[PDB]
Paper text:
The genomes of coronaviruses usually encode a long polypeptide which must be cleaved by main protease (alternatively named 3-chymotrypsin-like protease, 3CLpro) for maturation of several critical components of viral replication machinery. Dimerization is critical for Mpro’s protease activity, because the N-terminal residue Ser1 of one protomer is part of the substrate-binding pocket of the other protomer. Similar to other coronaviral Mpro, CCoV Mpro can be divided into three domains: domain I (residues 11–100), domain II (residues 101–198), and domain III (residues 199–299).
The asymmetric unit (A.U.) contains eight protomers of CCoV Mpro, which assemble into four functional dimers. Domains I and II adopt conserved chymotrypsin-like folds, in which the GC376 binds into the cleft between them. The root mean square deviations of the eight protomers of CCoV Mpro range from 0.321 to ~0.474 Å for 231~268 Cα atom pairs, showing nearly identical conformations among them. Similar to other Mpro-GC376 structures, the hydroxyl group of the (R)-hemithioacetal of GC376 forms a hydrogen bond with the imidazole ring of H41 of CCoV Mpro. However, the hydroxyl group of (S)-hemithioacetal of GC376 forms weak H-bonds with the backbone amide of G142 and C144 (3.9 Å and 4.0 Å, respectively) of CCoV Mpro.
Residue numbers in the entry:
A (entry chain B), B (entry chain A): 1 to 299
Write the structure that this text describes.
Amino acid sequence: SGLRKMAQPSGLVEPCIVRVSYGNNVLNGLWLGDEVICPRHVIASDTTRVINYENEMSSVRLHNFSVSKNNVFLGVVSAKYKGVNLVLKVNQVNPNTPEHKFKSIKAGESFNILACYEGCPGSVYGVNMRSQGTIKGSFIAGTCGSVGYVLENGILYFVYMHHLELGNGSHVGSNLEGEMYGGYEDQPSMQLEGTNVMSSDNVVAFLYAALINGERWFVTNTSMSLESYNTWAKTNSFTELSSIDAFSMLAAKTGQSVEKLLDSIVRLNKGFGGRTILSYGSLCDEFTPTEVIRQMYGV
Amino acid sequence: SGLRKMAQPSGLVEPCIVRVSYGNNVLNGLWLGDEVICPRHVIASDTTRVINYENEMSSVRLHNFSVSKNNVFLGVVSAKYKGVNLVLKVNQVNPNTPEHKFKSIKAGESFNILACYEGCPGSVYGVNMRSQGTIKGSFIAGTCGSVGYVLENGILYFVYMHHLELGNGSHVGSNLEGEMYGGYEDQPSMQLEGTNVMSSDNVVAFLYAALINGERWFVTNTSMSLESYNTWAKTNSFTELSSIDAFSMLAAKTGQSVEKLLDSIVRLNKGFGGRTILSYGSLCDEFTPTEVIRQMYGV
Ligand SMILES: *[C@H](O)[C@H](C[C@@H]1CCNC1=O)NC(=O)[C@H](CC(C)C)NC(=O)OCc1ccccc1
């Protein structure tokens, strides 16, 4: 059957993406109604040195912006900050505005990047939020403003707008409210990511995926308890397991129990000794339980 | 920077997928104009035993088809039988029909899967075609007639319809003209894939990606000439790198020559010494030169 990191379709989101430029700064904006949200660092004259955003807003001239979509130019009428984002009121309303809410993504939850280079939708991949509020995506010069979204029970949420990349390769963005995940600064300064807490829920779903695909070697007769585990987790940089009921269907279809895999995590966290689960030489927390159920049984 | 397997956006394609059933079989059709393409085995009374296709098609009533989108039912008037594909003429034309062409994918080449469960919305993800005309995607019961596509020069090409899974779990499909890739049969019989042959272009592309992400341990003070490598490849299940001029820019940007990388393949094909390259445990041929240049530079 196979296991692949998937994106939910880009259809509702593609038509919302605009080229936003100012001086030498070209990046991406989100166009809902008459509003256009994009990273504020697009104003700054020099983004390689510390920036004064009070100064930069004070000498902002609305005629200098070049907000565009396709062969439509959107004139700017108002520019305020909201957190690290810059909310522009533009002269047009997006005929293709979808029913949407804004939500903040939490450590362990999966979402979709529409990676856009300087105003063009480019590619869709699925990501997973790490404990320190970073993602391990693919982002370059020109992809700031690239938009993250989830679809839950018919509802479209926008959840992420791309800002920076940390010394260690990690990628940092903001919720559409304008708070940087992880509390990181919209500055070029050195910022350390700090130690990474693996999602116990997501590893369990991954191993359940392994089983459904035939890989069984990692499972013994040993079962660790929810209480035993959560204690072990607290000193081995691993989350406390939400609940056993999350995996009910998965436990049924395999005849293997969360407590059976919770022990697998412990034995494998010490090594694979050269073995691979679905071609990984190491445990993977990329996949939520929801993704595995969807991808293994179409639910 | 980072490297991910990506997909071109799906928003032209999403609205073309319908649900097609006949008897106990349910799968996906492509609705363009008044035409629904779909795999012919939708008509097989039992899809786990070898199928007499001329008998099963000889007793087929077109009224026994079900073809729906958003529980709006379309009515079948005619069909033509075209290779392993069925082409149903329906009473209604698809209002959301994108300007499209058709092409056939060659080994080495990348394309996008929209994976739909039983006409349902689905998930998007990039694949790459292996030497035997298979892919290693993610497919389950209910996902047949799921569609592959490339966007080249702003032109949408439909290129893949999904049919079956080999024992090894490789995935087989057809172009939209009903010719099945790698010549496989539309049957549950145990068909063997054949020897995988790795794309040399794609492995070089990949090592350039690693070079650009600061992973350098594989490069050495040794170059292998093109003819020299081509000899080695013929007897090691690798394609013949035809040119070097594809990699001109990656050569320039990185300072490393194709030949340095050609020699790295020969060494690394022996095995990684328990090291990794962008968290892979052996050479990767899933990324074309084009994909890497796009992803590292925005071109
Ligand atoms: C199409 O509905 C289905 C897609 C298969 C289901 C499992 N993964 C896929 O890609 N096609 C079939 O089931 C196909 C039927 C025709 C060839 C007549 N047979 C085949 O795909 O192998 C059956 C199989 C089912 C479950 C696991 C492994 C193989």
